[PDB]
Structure 1
Amino acid sequence: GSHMKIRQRQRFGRLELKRISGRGFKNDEEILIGNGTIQKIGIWDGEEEFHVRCGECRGILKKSKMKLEKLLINSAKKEDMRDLIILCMVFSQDTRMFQGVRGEINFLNRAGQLLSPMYQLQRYFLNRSSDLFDQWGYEESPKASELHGINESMNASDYTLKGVVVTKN
């Protein structure tokens, strides 16, 4: 439907979600993507908390408008952690995710049909993940030792992708 309901499993392609709290309101906005093209996109506004999964990787997501606030992941198979992080970055509509679009991206297919902007961004980044990580930035990992940082190669690290933390497991 239109909005993800508390406790309801939902899909955004490869990302699975399930609301813990909050409400979003969606408004259309002209967004500048890093391409230099300006595209009309449905921007959610409000604080939202979700359970998320990509394959075997689980976590909890907090967002606000156009910002991934916090993402706590449970340790898992590396490919899945990497995609869960990408899918969370796109799902949150973070200003930095928009900036990382470098190459051409289509919002219309060759038959001239209408494609989903958020879906097409997910497709662009699952395939060119670098292009998001370039924009993302690092911060000091959490002081506690039940919590670790992770870098874009998915190894534990003393500096971590901003807002991202890992628990074992």
Structure 2
Amino acid sequence: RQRFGRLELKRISGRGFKNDEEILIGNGTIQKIGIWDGEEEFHVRCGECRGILKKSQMRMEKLLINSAKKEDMKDLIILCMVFSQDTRMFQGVRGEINFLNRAGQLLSPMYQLQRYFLNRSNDLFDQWGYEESPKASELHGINELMNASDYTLKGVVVTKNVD
């Protein structure tokens, strides 16, 4: 099991293979990043929100989460978008990613990105895009307010709390 900031993950399936790549991100800077290749699925948790994450190389394919405190839902979605290394997430960077840690050093790129988008989720969501919500009975779409809606952040769905 693994941790990516407040994101907690447990592998469900697949294997990732990391390759160092130079990535040209949205603010016109080149970052060196271990890019994970391959299909992978993870149980994911952030605080009280739990879900299933499906990803492939630089692509979040699907994110299924439960209803929870909105701040936990939103952070889970963002952390999953960053963790999946989605190209839309890389392209969403506008500002600088030059955060210093409590030690005077630059955070590593993936941790810059996590810190950046948790701070500027609109830069991510505007870049990410919306699509028609699934109409499968047990799922609904979710907008940037973490409200159920007819449109959803692409690839994200929420389960209803049903007894």
TM-score (norm 2): 0.93
Moved more, 55-64 or 135-144: 135-144
Moved over 3 A (4+): 107-114
Sequence identity (%): 96
The number of residue pairs the alignment matches comes to: 161
Q: Any gaps of 5 or more consecutive residues in structure 2?
A: none
Residue 53 (structure 1) aligned with residue 45 (structure 2) = yes
Q: Any gaps of 5 or more consecutive residues in structure 1?
A: 1-8
Asked whether the equivalents of residues 149 and 156 of structure 1 are also in contact (C-alpha less than 8 Å), the reply is: yes
CA distance in 2, matches of 1:154, 1:65: 26
Partner residue of 1:145 out of 137, 148, 152:
137
Moved more, 73-82 or 103-112: 103-112
2:55 counterpart SS class: strand
2:102 counterpart SS class: coil
Asked whether the equivalents of residues 88 and 124 of structure 2 are also in contact (C-alpha less than 8 Å), the reply is: yes
CA distance in 2, matches of 1:130, 1:108: 22
CA distance in 1, matches of 2:8, 2:104: 29
Counting only pairs closer than 5 Å after superposition, residues 1-169 of structure 1 correspond to structure 2 as: 9-106=1-98, 113=105, 115-169=107-161
Asked whether the equivalents of residues 82 and 89 of structure 2 are also in contact (C-alpha less than 8 Å), the reply is: yes
Residues 111 and 135 of structure 1, relative CA distance in 2, 3 Å threshold: same
* Superimposed CA distance per residue, residues 22-60 of structure 1 (whole angstroms, 9 cap, x where no aligned partner): 100001111111110111111000000000001100000
Shift of 1:109: 6.2
2:88 counterpart SS class: helix
Asked whether the equivalents of residues 82 and 154 of structure 1 are also in contact (C-alpha less than 8 Å), the reply is: yes
Asked whether the equivalents of residues 107 and 117 of structure 1 are also in contact (C-alpha less than 8 Å), the reply is: no
CA distance in 2, matches of 1:109, 1:52: 25
> RMSD value over aligned CA atoms?
1.6
